[PDB]
């Protein structure tokens with residue numbers, strides 16, 4: 001009579017990493033890609049023979065900086081003249097050009113110079129997330145919910161839908177990232193009465209705090225605040241400067257001018273930073289870092305915490321601003337939700353818990369997966385077509 005319907009997917013289309021989930025058998029499955037990764041880099045690389053997307057693009061970035069595109073989310077739905085765009089362009093190794101006051105990324109691809117709109121680059125990331133899901137389900141996927149930041153305007157939301165349509169996806173709905181994190185915890189299923197929820201989102205390059213009110217499953221964004229110049233990469237930079245100084249003291253050599261050595265040091269620092277979230281110390285072991293000298297050293301969690309102390313404390317300023325804007329007091333917040341990999345940092349959690357006078361933090365859903373989790377829960381709700389009984 002009626003054939004079984006394919007599952008719909010929830011996609012967190014992130015600035016630096018994207019994540020895909022599916023709700024089946026009363027539970028969400030976050031889908032790992034073919035390299036076993038639960039999150040996929042939002043990177044697209046171009047060569048004379050191939051277009052690479054995800055881990056394959058990010059793993060060759062060092063020798064192909066001009067033709068590897070990342071951060072398209074910072075350009076999506078914006079004008080080329082926008083002050084945000086002009087500032088970001090100074091930090092990017094790829095070319096950004098002006099086509100009718102609309103930014104386009106220009107690269108060498110398959111023997112030609114090619115320019116792409118930000119929605120086209122995002123459609124390539126969405127095609128990879130769709131293929132990750134189809135490899136797990138074993139059938140073609142059509143329907144998806146895609147998330148965006150709460151501060152995205154109409155043009156930014158329409159360009160995200162356009163990216164979905166180019167990728168061959170039927171976009172069920174564009175939902176806000178903090179709303180998706182709240183849905184992941186079922187904070188919209190607690191019944192009658194108003195609930196105030198704070199979402200604390202610390203990413204690779206930006207920090208966002210959102211205050212939502214939930215009443216009978218209805219969401220209202222009460223306040224947004226953040227820091228565009230605060231994220232995981234700033235903590236990596238602090239360890240980089242620390243170890244460059246350490247090499248100078250120990251071997252009387254300045255390494256800061258060999259890009260390969262700085263890159264090898266930064267890659268090692270980012271992994272040591274992750275180890276320090278679960279261990280009280282971490283080792284750093286690089287062979288022939290500079291002038292055939294092996295760099296074998298360590299860093300305690302106490303020293304790393306000291307190195308990033310001002311940065312961690314500065315996350316509380318947008319929290320206080322969001323609470324003033326929402327016209328609420330900290331005691332009036334019912335639930336605290338953590339979003340982003342950088343929230344695993346024990347000191348970040350301690351500062352926030354202390355700010356909210358010992359309150360529990362919702363961190364049981366991996367913070368780098370919570371947004372995709374909630375988008376998957378929403379996607380399964382949106383495709384239901386139940387007919388009422390007599």
Ligand SMILES: Nc1ncnc2c1nc(Br)n2[C@@H]1O[C@H](CO)[C@@H](O)[C@H]1O
Pocket residue numbers: 016017203204205231232233270273274275277340341342343344345368
């Ligand atoms: N366990 C973790 N402890 C500390 N940091 C982490 C962890 N896992 C992830 Br993921 N990160 C950082 O999150 C950011 C996501 O873009 C990157 O800067 C990652 O380094």
Ligand SMILES: [Mg+2]
Pocket residue numbers: 014177203339340371
């Ligand atoms: Mg995010």
